[PDB]
Amino acid sequence: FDELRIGLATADDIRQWSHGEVKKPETINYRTLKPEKDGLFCEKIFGPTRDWECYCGKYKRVRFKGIICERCGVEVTRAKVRRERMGHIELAAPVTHIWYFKGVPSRLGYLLDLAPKDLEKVIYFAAYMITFVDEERRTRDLPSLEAHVSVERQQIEQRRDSDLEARAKKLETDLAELEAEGAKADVRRKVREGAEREMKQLRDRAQREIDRLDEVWNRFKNLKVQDLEGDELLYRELRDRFGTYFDGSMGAAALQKRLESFDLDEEAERLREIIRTGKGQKKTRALKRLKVVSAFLQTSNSPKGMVLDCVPVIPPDLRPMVQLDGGRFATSDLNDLYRRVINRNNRLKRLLDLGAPEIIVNNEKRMLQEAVDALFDNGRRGRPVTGPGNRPLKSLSDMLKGKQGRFRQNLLGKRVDYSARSVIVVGPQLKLHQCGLPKAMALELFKPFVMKRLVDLNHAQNIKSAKRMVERGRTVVYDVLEEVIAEHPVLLNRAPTLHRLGIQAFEPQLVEGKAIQIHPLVCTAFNADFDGDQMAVHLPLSAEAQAEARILMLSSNNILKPADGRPVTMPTQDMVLGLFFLTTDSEGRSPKGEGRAFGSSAEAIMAFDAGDLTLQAKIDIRFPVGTIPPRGFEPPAREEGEPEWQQGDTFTLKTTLGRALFNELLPEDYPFVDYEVGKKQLSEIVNDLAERYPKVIVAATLDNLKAAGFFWATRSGVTVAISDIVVPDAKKEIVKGYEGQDEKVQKQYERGLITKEERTQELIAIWTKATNEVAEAMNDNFPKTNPVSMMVNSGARGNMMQMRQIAGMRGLVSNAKNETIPRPIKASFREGLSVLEYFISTHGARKGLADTALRTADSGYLTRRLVDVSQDVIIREEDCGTERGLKLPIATRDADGTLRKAEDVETSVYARMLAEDVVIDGKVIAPANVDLGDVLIDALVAHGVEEVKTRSILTCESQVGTCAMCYGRSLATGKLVDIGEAVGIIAAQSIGEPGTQLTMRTFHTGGVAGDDITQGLPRVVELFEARTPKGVAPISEASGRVRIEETEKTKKIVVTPDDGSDETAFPISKRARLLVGEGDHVEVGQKLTVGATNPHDVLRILGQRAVQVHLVGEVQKVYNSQGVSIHDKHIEIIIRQMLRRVTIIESGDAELLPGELVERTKFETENRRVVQEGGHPASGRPQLMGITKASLATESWLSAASFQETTRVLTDAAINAKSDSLIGLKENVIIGKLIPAGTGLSRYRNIRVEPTEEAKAAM
DNA sequence: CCGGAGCGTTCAGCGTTCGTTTATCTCCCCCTGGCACTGTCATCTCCGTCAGACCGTCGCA
DNA sequence: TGCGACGGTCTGACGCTCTACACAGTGCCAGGGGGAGATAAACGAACGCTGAACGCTCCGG
Ligand SMILES: [Mg+2]
Ligand SMILES: [Zn+2]
Ligand SMILES: [Zn+2]
């Protein structure tokens, strides 16, 4: 598996694959139910349907396998041969391929200079095509044919003159005889009128035949190859008049004959000549066509695959006709399509056997062509073939395309064995590495292991007896099951699996019931509530799989979230409330025994059990030797005339008993914490523990925190009664005053002194004031003791706006189609809404539900696009030799006389490395190539630095992939990233995970459309897809004088740069709201109008670093407006994948086409190649493209095919005959090999393991 | 004190019975061919995606 | 040729199981060729009958 090739398949290859001809449309016999001979499903062509048997019934045994039966020809072998053995159909008339005709010009190619409508007219038998003309023979005898035509014209004119003379004589004769007879008074006038009517009719006939001769003559005089004529009567006239001069044809045979005489190299030369001298859209034409001609010139694939003579067939087991219970049959649609193809081909053969008219033959040929096209693509042209009358008939290309195709439903995602699924329940008795599997589910997963152990422990005689015991379910089987599942990890997995931690390895443990017991401490890593949530369990099977489960996937090793490096395995519902209650202050709770000395924590616990001491009471408590004092305890000390060190020995501290118990949970080496914990302080404590302590200690400490959090949340006394939710007493008088002034405004409006829009605006303004003020009143009324505030102020669960709309009034609520009702909801959920208030609240609720459904769908789509563009980005080197980096701001927004560090330094500068040392006073502050943390950044900002040159992934120049040092330390593990970690996939998952968490939509348009830019997740998609924004703000090209032009039809802006530069003019709509002065000084940096800048021009006029900063900052301010934090390197990986290409111009010396996508590495290699030859290099402008366009424009066609476009990329690969190296992860998942990342690298699989000499000597 | 008779086992004459084929005689399946007043253009699709892009196409300028 | 715009074309439109189903209006027979099954015979084989015949222990007058 060095690589995988693809190309056009000629008739020879199709015949070589085939084991025979499918000469009959019959599939199976209706009585014997055996496949027919020499047709579809035939055993002679496709192999035996039985095992080692054959059609005629002879040769039943297995011994004489691999022989050809003389009676029927069926080779005796296995039935699975029918999954690999194919045949072919020979066509009576050649037909074209529907992928290449009727497609994109990158796919059709315009190989022959014909329009797509012209190709349609020629191949579907509506117009003849002149494939060959003897041009030199036609031009050599021009005087002879001209003389013949002149002779024909002369004799025609002589006949016309003789006829005119005879007609005149007849007219004179009849006039004379009817004027001599005198039958009527004016019969001579009537006969003269009839005669002249005859004269004009014959003159019309003469002029129409003269025009016919003239038009056929000028049709022959302008006759070239690839010239069509719609009128078959006209072509018949040319054939009957002119012979052996021009060769004509009709249908796909005309294209085949044209491709027989096609001379592609001279056409390529002519297109290159037009490239040298050409303008306009034809230029682009002269570009695109040339590319496809090059695709037929450089590679070895002949264009004989353009039109096909033989049709391959699927092996019959991949288009099965299976028996169904009740005597029915289930048949694939490809059997119907193939049957139609053979039917039409056989009918065409029968028509060609005997004498048939050309119209019937051409009609049957067109039917055969349409049958082949519907076989390859049903529904590409016209109405799709339906069948029973309900749904379109599935074709060959419809299972290589879309969600139902082979690439996405059967290769990337597959069903698995040794897997199960059950609902989850919380088990607090479990450790962090444990999960509770039911008896039946674990017995079914570990069935062969249980059978082997039963055989080994001689409880069963053999495998069959062990299987019978397992199926019966005896108690010794369950004892064996308990013995087996130990030390054998299983992978728990929740279905949405947005990010990396959706699959985690746990040690299984037998539990009762039928539900999986999961640890609470890990649930939010899975985003798993216990409303109802089925989790799947997969079984790592070999030593490698369960080794990776134990080492890489263990749930106790995944404390930190890979998105931003913050801890994720500290859920907050009940444990944080308990720890907060334990560690909170004595505010609002009656402290008994406050301010009394205690000898030890045990005595304080005894006093608490006695009841004369409460948990929250400032007491003077002594601590034994080995207890580390708080970090703030060091500057104070005990007063003594002798030297003392309270860092290692006993000390007294003024604290509550709850803090003493909480620090009993924490390790003895950890410094004492003397503050209210809650949630955020718990986050910094857990982050410090994960940073400074080993994994097992961290797992034990989170287990202790979990256990004591549950324990003290039980005794915290939190509950909900109707007296626990309190409406403010001020709310009644405040809403009374606001209704009084609202009644005053309304009775003022009834006189018409104010418009309704102004009244609505002031009403929503004053009611927003009222709801903010009553929120303030509620936030003043609450005590620190009631459970609802105790669980919203502790970060446990809840938000302040939920308490605002539970205790105080709901506030302004959006109406349908996104405006606000002027009348608010004055009732709290405790008081109960009225009927109409409930209705207008349902207006917003249903919108929210629909919005979050579509938002999570779009987030999944964005995640898929990001993963497919960001793959094949793997740390492949330990370090670069580089010292180039990114200049990031470290301290900003400084006041007078002080310096403040950056607000978002955690996701911008942290977890990176310095490209070079930093010195301010001649001494180094921080070394080079070290991770940045709190203390180092604090030292930098204290010593007085304003910017830091840090080593980023955008500036990485490595020969393969990116290095570990330029990427920086990994955020999932907190250490330096290993060589082989897929950083692109981690980056894509981290970007796409909070897409459903954003929950953003424009509140109100304000009555104007287009004034507001896209916000939320669609803004992120627009940013990553390189699309021009909805509100575009043009950027000035150069510094100069800017002025406005207020033309009535459309506004206009004109800026003239100084230093003789050319003036640039931008058109602006009348609804502009710009911010630049009229006739003022402007430069490149600022924007002329207000809106969202287009990143393409930002790349164009400012540079690649400026547009990198722009994109990173834009996506980070979209994400930061909600509150989600994502590190900058995750964005920068995709941004580097975004700027990887270049658009080339004046490429007359680099010997390739101009104005197309070129990779940076290939362009640079071509630049060295052309400067080593001495020629001047071509020009190249960096091109910023979407993630979809960067995904499709990839070297490997397997990854391109498995992505969105599935038919066009395969045609393009077939024309280009491109073979893909099997590097990358999608085309290694597809083929089944190891991915080239992580444990699948070559540098990890080449180690050899043997024991040491002393270990052998010991035993 | 061998001699004969009865008994055990083992083979050559012709005498019948099997093991496996063969052509002829009913019953059925399956494919090609005949019908002679005249009778010479069907068929319903497809709408309250959807969101914007990519692209060629095309008449106006 | 540049212009918008007109239009067709094309693509996907988070994830799983618990659940999970099936699918409907217009002819008819005669003459002839093959192979499935029943028939009665046939050339060759071996299958039995004929006890005879060789040789042994044998009780023996
Ligand atoms: Mg749930
Ligand atoms: Zn056979
Ligand atoms: Zn590097």
Q: From the DSSP assignment, how many helices (H) and strands (E) are in chain A?
A: 44, 33
Which bases of chain B come closer than 7 Å to a protein CB?
29-30, 52-58
Distance in Å, residue A58 CA to nucleotide B19 C1':
21
CB count within 10 Å of CB A759 equals: 16
Nucleotide nearest to A861 (CA to C1'): C14
Residue carrying structure tokens 């003019």:
A1065
Nearest C-alpha neighbor of A511 from the set A446, A441, A436, A444: A436
Phi then psi dihedrals of residue A1252, to 5 deg? -75, 165
Class of the domain covering A574-716 = mainly alpha
Q: Which one-letter amino acid corresponds to residue A621?
A: I
C-alpha to C-alpha distance for A233 and A221, rounded to whole angstroms: 18
Using CB atoms within 10 A of its CB, is residue A477 exposed (0-12), middle (13-18) or buried (19+)? Answer: buried
DSSP A564: T
Task: Mark out the alpha helices in A630-725 (DSSP H runs).
Answer: 657-665, 680-692, 695-714
Containing H/E element for A133?
Answer: strand A128-133
Give the strand pairing for A86-96 and A18-21.
parallel
* Cβ-based neighbours of A597, under 8 Å, separated by 6 or more: A619, A620, A621, A622, A652
Q: Three-state SS string across A107-132, please?
A: HHCCCCCCCHHHHHHHHCCCCEEEEE
Q: Which nucleotide is nearest, taking the CA of residue A36 and each C1'? A: B30
CB A146 within 8 A of CB A217: no
Instruction: Return the number of other C-beta atoms located less than 10 Å from residue A467's C-beta.
Output: 16
- Burial of A692 per CB tally in 10 Å (0-12, 13-18, 19+): exposed
CA distances from A949 to A976, A1106, A1204 (A): 19, 15, 39
Q: Hunting for tokens 């066609």 — which residue is that?
A: A1197
Q: Cβ of A495 < 7 Å from strand B?
A: no
- How many A from CA of A971 to the centre of ligand 3? 18
- Would you say the C-alpha torsion A257, A259, A265, A267 has a positive or negative sign? positive
Instruction: Provide CATH code, domain A729-850.
Output: 1.10.132.30
B53 closest protein residue (CA to C1'): A1027
Question: Could you give the CA distance from residue A419 to residue A538 in angstroms, rounded to a whole number?
Answer: 4
Q: How far is the CA of A76 from the centre of ligand 2 (A)?
A: 9
Distance A1185 CA to ligand 1 centre (A): 38
Q: Spell out the residues 6+ positions from residue A771 whose beta carbon is closer than 8 angstroms to its own.
A: A804, A808, A809, A811, A812, A824
Contacts of A215 (CB under 8 A, 6+ apart): none
Percent of chain A that is helix, strand, coil (3-state, to 5)? 45, 15, 40
From the CA of A672 to the C1' of B13: give the distance in Å: 123
Experimental method: cryo-EM
The residue type found at A259 is L
The Cα–Cα gap between A778 and A726 comes to 8
CA dist., res. A974 & res. A567, Å (int): 11
CA of A388 to C1' of C26 (A): 18
Instruction: Indicate the burial class of A1083 (C-beta count within 10 angstroms; 0-12, 13-18, 19 or more).
Output: exposed
Ligand at minimal distance from the CA of A977 is 3
Closest residue by Cα to residue A335 from A597, A698, A22: A22
One DSSP character per residue, A473-530 reads T-HHHHHHHHHHSTT--EEEEESS--SGGGEEEEEEEEESSSSEEE-GGGHHHHT--S
Q: Are A798 and A792 in contact (CB under 8 A)?
A: yes
Helix orientation angle between A280-297 and A1208-1216, rounded to the nearest 10 degrees: 60
Distance CA A674, CA A583 (A): 8
Angstrom distance (rounded) from CA A1187 to CA A250: 45
What residue has its CA nearest to the C1' of C16? A495
Q: Give the Cα separation of A620 and A353 in Å (integer).
A: 113
Chain C positions with any atom < 7 A from a protein CB? 1-2, 10-18, 24
**By C-alpha distance, which of A780, A833, A785, A827 is closest to A808?**
A827
Which of A565, A510, A503 lies closest to A537 in space, CA to CA?
Answer: A503
How far is ligand 3, taken at its centre, from the CA of residue A864, in Å?
Answer: 27
Q: Which among A911, A926, A927 has a CA at the least distance from the CA of A975?
A: A911
**Is residue A688 a contact partner of residue A560, using CB atoms and an 8 Å limit?**
no
Alpha carbon distance A967, A910 (integer Å): 12
Ligand in nearest proximity to the CA of A954: 3
Q: Which of A655, A684, A686, A687 is nearest to A672 (CA)?
A: A655
d(CA A604, CA A597): 9
Breaks in chain A after (C-N > 2.5 angstroms): none
Q: Does strand B come within 7 Å of the CB of A360?
A: no
DSSP A805-849: HHHS--B--B-TTS-B-SS-B---TTT---HHHHHHHHHHHHHHH
Q: Name the one residue in this structure whose structure tokens are 């270990």.
A: A1255
Which nt has its C1' nearest the CA of A284? Answer: B56
Query: Among candidates A694, A812, A823, A696, which has minimal Cα distance to A760?
Result: A823
Ligand (nearest to CA of A968): 3
Which of A1144, A1146, A1145, A1148 is closest to A1163 using CA atoms? A1144
Distance (Å, rounded) from C-alpha A794 to C-alpha A777? 20
Contacts of A391 (CB under 8 A, 6+ apart): none
Taking the C1' atom of C14, which residue's CA lies nearest?
A860
What DSSP assignment string belongs to A570-601? ---SSHHHHHHHHH---SSS--SS-S-EESSH
Separation of CA A819 from chain center = 33
A134's CB contacts (< 8 A; 6+ apart) are A245, A246
User: CA–C1' distance A288–B61 (Å)?
Assistant: 27
> How many residues comprise chain A?
1259
CA–CA separation, A615 and A624 (whole Å):
20
Cβ-based contacts with strand C at under 7 Å: A 102-103, 279-282, 380, 388, 401-403, 413, 415, 421-422, 495-496, 498, 534, 853, 856-857, 859-861, 864, 1204-1208
Ligand in nearest proximity to the CA of A72 = 2
Q: What is the 3-state secondary structure (H, E, C) of A952-1004?
A: CCCCCCCCCCEEHHHHCECCCCCCECCCCCEHHHHHHHHHHHHHCCCCCCCCC
Look-up: residue for tokens 């796409």?
A992
Q: How far is the CA of A534 from the centre of ligand 1 (A)?
A: 9
A517 pairs with which residues across the strands? A425, A436
Judge contact between A925 and A890, C-beta under 8 A: no
Q: Are strands A913-914 and A651-655 parallel, antiparallel or unpaired?
A: unpaired
Residue A668: exposure state from Cβ atoms within 10 A (0-12, 13-18, ≥19): exposed
Please spell the DSSP secondary structure of A12-29, one letter per residue.
Answer: HHHHHHEEEE------B-
Which of helix, strand or coil describes residue A1040? strand
Question: What spatial distance separates the first Cα and last Cα of chain A, rounded to whole Å?
Answer: 44
Binding-site residue numbers of A are 54, 56, 69, 72, 529, 531, 533, 880, 956, 963, 966
Identify whether the C-beta of residue A430 lies closer than 8 Å to the C-beta of residue A461: no
Q: How many CB atoms sit inside 10 A of residue A194's CB?
A: 11
A1061 beta carbon < 7 A from strand B?
no
- For A1100, residues 6+ apart whose C-beta sits below 8 A from its C-beta are A1181
How many Å is the Cα radius of gyration of chain A? 42
Nucleic acid strand B within 7 Å of A116 CB: yes
Q: How many CA atoms lie within 13 A of A306 on its CB side?
A: 26
A328: tokens are 């029915």
Cα angle for residues A106, A108, A111 (degrees, 5° grid): 100
Residue A313: alpha-carbon gap to chain centroid: 33
Checking A970-976 for CB contacts under 8 A at 24+ apart, the result is A970/A562, A970/A911, A971/A560, A971/A561, A971/A562, A971/A563, A971/A564, A971/A565, A971/A911, A971/A1127, A972/A500, A972/A558, A972/A560, A972/A561, A972/A562, A972/A565, A973/A557, A973/A560, A974/A560, A974/A565, A974/A690, A974/A691, A976/A931
Do A1136 and A953 touch, CB atoms closer than 8 A?
Answer: yes
3-state secondary structure of A1028: coil
List residues forming the annotated binding site of A for Mg(2+): 529, 531, 533
